[PDB]
Amino acid sequence: TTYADFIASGRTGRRNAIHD
């Protein structure tokens, strides 16, 4: 499921803004 794929992903934690 889409859920299972998100939960197994590496971006489920707090996401910080982009910095160069």
Add this chain to the structure above:
Amino acid sequence: VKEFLAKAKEDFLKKWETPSQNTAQLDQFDRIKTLGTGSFGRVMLVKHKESGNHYAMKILDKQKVVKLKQIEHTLNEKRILQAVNFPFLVKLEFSFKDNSNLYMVMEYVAGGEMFSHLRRIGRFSEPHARFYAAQIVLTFEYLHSLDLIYRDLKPENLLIDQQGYIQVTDFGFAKRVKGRTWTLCGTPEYLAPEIILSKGYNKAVDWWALGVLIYEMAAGYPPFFADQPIQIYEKIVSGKVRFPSHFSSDLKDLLRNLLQVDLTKRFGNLKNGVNDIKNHKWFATTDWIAIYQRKVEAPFIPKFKGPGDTSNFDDYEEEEIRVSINEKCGKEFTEF
């Protein structure tokens, strides 16, 4: 509303033109615990000695700000935060700097980040998500009328107060602009396609971000996700969006209008502007005046045990606040 907005703009301009500075100092507070961190600073729960009140202090290392090229952005951050006034925006209580750091002392919003609750519970029911969304909608209306672009909407930058309402924080990328701008900034999952394509953009990126927020709140996961930002961008640019089976027809319709690549069709950026969103079927049960007045029934009210309780926040490794005997980047931050 156009009556209210006009007065608000007069109030904002006086402050934008003559910003307040140096309204406190470091030794007037007792640093207690870090509430959260980002790419740029750290926010600690602090207590003001003379009054006994708690506040949330954002600390920016001047040398780090320079290295990451956020000098102008930080000046924007403080200059704007001290001038705005709206029921759903966090208040800047005091601000100041020293040899090493820059400080923004905000009102402490004890309910925790929306992010934490959202991931714990999994997702929000439509009426629940709608309650938060209406608030964001009225906030972008206020901000946009002042010629301001927010640029960093995400659950991590949203906090729940004692009444169960939203308080927007982190004006890091907020900028006052008439026309277009080109800075590639924000958070990968929430970037609009114009940003990624380096074509120059406007306020409409905020409305695309709202579409992303509503989707994440009601689904529990974002519309475009992957392991690396580059993969994420490919998905955003393609534009293909897939909705969970529980999404109501009304919600899906609104989202196709917000997550709209064609900026000449995206809700919020049309003739009727914000009214296309307010009058949408998904928002029919919404009493726009009642919400602004905080008279509406909050779906979830965070539990808080006394002043200074940080139970609604994650724990963070503490780091000693250093202050050199030598002033750093003095000229660069003169106006701060």
